[PDB]
Structure 1
Amino acid sequence: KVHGSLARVGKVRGQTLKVAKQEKKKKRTGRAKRRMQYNRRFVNVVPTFGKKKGPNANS
């Protein structure tokens, strides 16, 4: 409405803490990474296994 009183702030962040996995490997740079996506998806393992499936899907 209009009100005036702040109450609670950063409540969720006050009990969630971050952590890190570091690296086995670097996250790839430019041209090499762009090429890598096309090879990893298609020329491998030429696709014949599975269907209707995402790159991060649990379906």
Structure 2
Amino acid sequence: SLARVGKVRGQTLKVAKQEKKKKRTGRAKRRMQYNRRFVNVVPTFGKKKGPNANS
């Protein structure tokens, strides 16, 4: 309807964002990505998960 405007954003739960260390950029980000792919870890067992797979 036109009389329910702004219901959910108006009525969510506002939580302040966090405050942490900055992320390295430039080549140093690319280097950390290189560091978490090939040279140190092995395929351990079974399938391969995703890098965000908190399950």
- Is TM > 0.5 for Structure 1 vs Structure 2? yes
TM-score under structure 2 length normalisation: 0.60
Distance 1:43 1:23, change over 3 A: farther
Q: Deviations over 1:12-53 (max 9, x none)?
A: 112223434534421221210011111112223344355331
Structure 1 gap segments, 5+ residues each:
none
Once the two structures are aligned, what percentage of the paired residues are identical? 100
Larger radius of gyration: 1
Length-normalised TM-score, structure 1: 0.58
How many residues align? The count is 55
| Pairing partner for 1:22 from 18, 21, 25 | 18
Aligned CA-pair RMSD: 2.6
Question: Superposed, which structure 2 residues align to 1:1-59 within 5 Å?
Answer: 6-20=2-16, 22-49=18-45, 51-58=47-54
